[PDB]
Design a protein around this ligand. Structure first.
Ligand SMILES: [Cl-]
Ligand SMILES: [Cl-]
Ligand SMILES: [Cl-]
Ligand SMILES: [Cl-]
Ligand SMILES: [Cl-]
Ligand SMILES: [Cl-]
Ligand SMILES: [Cl-]
Ligand code: NA
Length: 129
């Protein structure tokens, strides 16, 4: 599924991400935009052989099981394929564990490089939330 901006903002708020660990909804929408372009089916292989999955590009090195990331963990206790669903519940639940892990949203390098410090409220501007 390819979400629209306000459609995703609404779904993220529906699943309790708005202001989770103090990160406003615009931070989450901006991270999704630059990680996946709002596409739930996005996959991208890393140089080290891990893969990032879904709307928030969650990495198999730590967070989900894809059966092909030797030495990796599965701290969200989910198959990485669950992170590609039209329903974002699994991605949200796992993202809540990642952003609690100690470095907040810096875990998402695209958030650190493209969203952090910016006018992230623009991402929810106009949305009926
Ligand atoms: Cl957009
Ligand atoms: Cl915001
Ligand atoms: Cl594996
Ligand atoms: Cl594990
Ligand atoms: Cl699995
Ligand atoms: Cl959803
Ligand atoms: Cl923080
Ligand atoms: Na893994």
């Amino acid at each position: 599924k390819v979400f629209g901006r306000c459609e995703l903002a609404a779904a993220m708020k529906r699943h309790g991400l708005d202001n989770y660990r103090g990160y406003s909804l615009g931070n989450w929408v901006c991270a999704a935009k630059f990680e996946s372009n709002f596409n739930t089916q996005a996959t991208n292989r890393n140089t080290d052989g891990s893969t990032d999955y879904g709307i928030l590009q969650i990495n198999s090195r730590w967070w989900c099981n894809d059966g092909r990331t030797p030495g990796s963990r599965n701290l969200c206790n989910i198959p990485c394929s669950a992170l590609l669903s039209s329903d974002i519940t699994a991605s949200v639940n796992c993202a809540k564990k990642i952003v609690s892990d100690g470095n907040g949203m810096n875990a998402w390098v695209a958030w650190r490089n493209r969203c952090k410090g910016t006018d992230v409220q623009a991402w929810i501007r106009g949305c009926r939330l």
